[PDB]
Design a protein around this nucleic acid. Structure first.
Length: 94
DNA sequence: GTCGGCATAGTGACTGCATATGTTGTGTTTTACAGTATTATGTAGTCTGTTTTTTATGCAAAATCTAATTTAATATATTGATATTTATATCATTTTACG
């Protein structure tokens, strides 16, 4: 399921909703979630999950191909935490 | 049947009678527009009452929107073996992107 296939299956089910409307809606939601995480704000969707931002202290990296040294500026990285409903439904085991 | 000599055979030139054609002159009959007058025309200049349209509120109907509020959901905080992501960047493959 890609970004396009996602809009396709959502437009097929929603007949009373223009296909073009669903196409833009999906693109605006993803862009809104990507912009929020950029501003430094978290995301919390009850049932789905919750996006966060974890800090990464600056450390002297090392080229994994050769083994040299490379500086690494301190930055933040997105982190998703599956919700309760998401885990239980995605968990096929016990 | 052709070739040789007056007779055929329509068409063209020639001359004057015979008559339609070209002018000149008198005279009747009717067309054709100018100028004032008569009156029902079509729009004009307004008034008036009915029909039409803009206008100023009025209110039951409709449900979102904001604040009070409770609770599942989220975060802190342990502890430590085990599993996943991680720095760089040239090759390789999938998906976006416009014509």
């Amino acid at each position: 399921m890609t970004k396009s296939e996602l809009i396709e299956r959502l437009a097929t089910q929603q007949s009373h909703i223009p296909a073009k409307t669903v196409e833009d809606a999906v693109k605006e939601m993803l862009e809104h979630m990507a912009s929020t995480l950029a501003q430094g704000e978290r995301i919390e969707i009850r049932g789905f999950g919750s996006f966060s931002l974890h800090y990464r202290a600056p450390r002297t990296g090392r080229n994994p191909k050769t083994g040299d040294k490379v500086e690494l500026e301190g930055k933040y990285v997105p982190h998703f935490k599956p919700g309760k409903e998401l885990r239980d439904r995605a968990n096929i085991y016990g």
